């Protein structure tokens, strides 16, 4: 049994593709995506958006779970990774495309979820990369907010109004779990998939990837 994708890179298995891993204090089994490949490897992927459309405007419930596939578009789960998060130390790294063919990547040092009881939120440490300067998403880590769920700080629920289940602020500078657009329809939505600090105001995105890592 694997904990993370780590362990199972460490383990030999060099290769991308599904594996499974089970949770920490417990026997439960999840299926994540191992990105091998990408710089060094032992990468858990944690949300993956390209369009296989699985429909984000899930509930508490399924976004704490996991839904869609991890061959393709998915959310793994935050009881998950909150619990993964808080064994160690992990990086978070979000990979980015848009439309014109231009990728990018915004990258922590730290980050985890508190549990569920906190409402999952969200903690980043030290941001690089190519994404931003400033990191999208609100500092001060926000509680998570879905549809059955509003915790975040706007007197509106963020998450009806920009749909998808995400760490909004007063709606923050970035929802990844937002309404997929496809090509000539990515532009002027407040209701995408953005990350401000790289494309900017309605930009919304063609693919995302959310991975996390420990120090390895
Ligand atoms: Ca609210």
């Given at each position: 049994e694997f904990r993370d994708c780590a362990e199972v890179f460490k383990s030999g298995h060099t290769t991308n593709g599904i594996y499974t891993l089970t949770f920490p204090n417990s026997t439960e089994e999840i299926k994540a995506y191992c990105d091998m490949e990408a710089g060094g490897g032992g990468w858990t992927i944690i949300q993956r958006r390209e369009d296989g459309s699985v429909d984000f405007q899930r509930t508490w419930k399924e976004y704490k779970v996991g839904f869609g596939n991890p061959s393709g578009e998915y959310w793994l789960g935050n009881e998950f990774?909150?619990?993964?998060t808080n064994q160690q130390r992990?990086?978070?790294?979000?990979?980015?495309?848009?439309?014109?063919?231009?990728?990018?990547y915004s990258l922590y040092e730290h980050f985890y979820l508190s549990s569920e009881e906190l409402?999952?939120?969200?903690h980043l440490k030290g941001l690089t990369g190519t994404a931003g300067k400033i990191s999208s998403i609100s500092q001060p880590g926000n509680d998570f907010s879905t549809k059955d769920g509003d915790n975040d700080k706007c007197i509106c629920k963020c998450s009806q109004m920009l749909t998808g289940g995400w760490w909004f602020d007063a709606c923050g500078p970035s929802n990844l779990n937002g309404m997929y657009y496809p090509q000539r329809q990515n532009t002027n939505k407040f209701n995408g998939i953005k990350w401000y600090y790289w494309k900017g105001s309605g930009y919304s995105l063609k693919a995302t990837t959310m991975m996390i890592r420990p120090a390895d």
């Open positions: 990774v909150s619990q993964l992990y990086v978070l790294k979000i990979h980015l495309k848009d439309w014109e063919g231009n990728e990018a409402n999952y939120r969200i």
